[PDB]
């Protein structure tokens with residue numbers, strides 16, 4: 258698909274058995290999801306952006322389905338204002354920016 | 357171009373006759389650049405990032421070149437950690453996300 262950018266590029270994802278809405282975000286290195294439980298081990302991380310840093314839990318080798326495309330990678334979980342699909346998973350679904 | 361996302365999608369921009377690096381950011385509604393001097397009047401804006409809100413200066417109808425593509429639109433100036441080209445200007449250069 259081709260997603261224009263007139264509006265936020267929001268898609269449905271499936272993660273942890275849950276459906277969520279998330280932003281396809283080429284400015285995010287990593288994928289950051291609002292608070293939820295995920296299985297397996299995790300470690301803490303700080304991530305920073307506008308307004309400063311938040312603490313998140315880093316879960317590795319998490320399968321996600323992004324607009325119907327499965328991928329695996331690291332997911333950060335914490336108090337993000339919006340669920341973000343970052344480049345670590347955008348690459349896996351073959352997403353590119355074109356102009 | 358077709359820009360893959362294995363590395364950050366950084367490009368050169370030109371604003372006020374000066375070259376700067378900036379991130380093509382589909383998760384940004386607006387374009388936010390570090391402190392610099394721009395002509396004309398500005399208006400206040402608050403923007404909420406991952407860490408909280410910051411105050412920026414909004415300048416409208418600013419001439420800006422992004423990766424060689426000419427745009428004229430709103431630039432927010434403030435203490436952002438990275439220069440980000442958001443959707444208001446990504447749309448002017450005809451960018452889409454594709455997968």
Ligand SMILES: CC(C)CN(C[C@@H](O)[C@H](Cc1cc(F)cc(F)c1)NC(=O)O[C@H]1C[C@H]2CO[C@H]3OCC[C@@H]1[C@@H]23)S(=O)(=O)c1ccc2nc(NC3CC3)sc2c1
Pocket residue numbers: 282283284285286287288289303304305306307337338339341343379381382383384385386387388403404405406407438440442
């Ligand atoms: C600022 C940018 C360099 C990085 N951000 C990604 C952005 O696309 C971010 C995504 C995001 C959208 C949103 F709606 C609310 C958020 F909290 C975060 N946009 C804004 O901050 O927009 C804000 C700044 C202005 C841009 O125009 C408007 O857009 C919407 C909201 C705001 C204004 S981020 O969310 O802070 C982000 C995401 C993952 C990520 N991964 C990291 N990994 C390793 C280095 C540590 S750091 C990191 C930071």
Ligand SMILES: [Cl-]
Pocket residue numbers: 329330331345346
């Ligand atoms: Cl990953």
Ligand SMILES: [Cl-]
Pocket residue numbers: 351360
């Ligand atoms: Cl590729």
Ligand code: NA
Pocket residue numbers: 296297298316317318319
């Ligand atoms: Na794991």
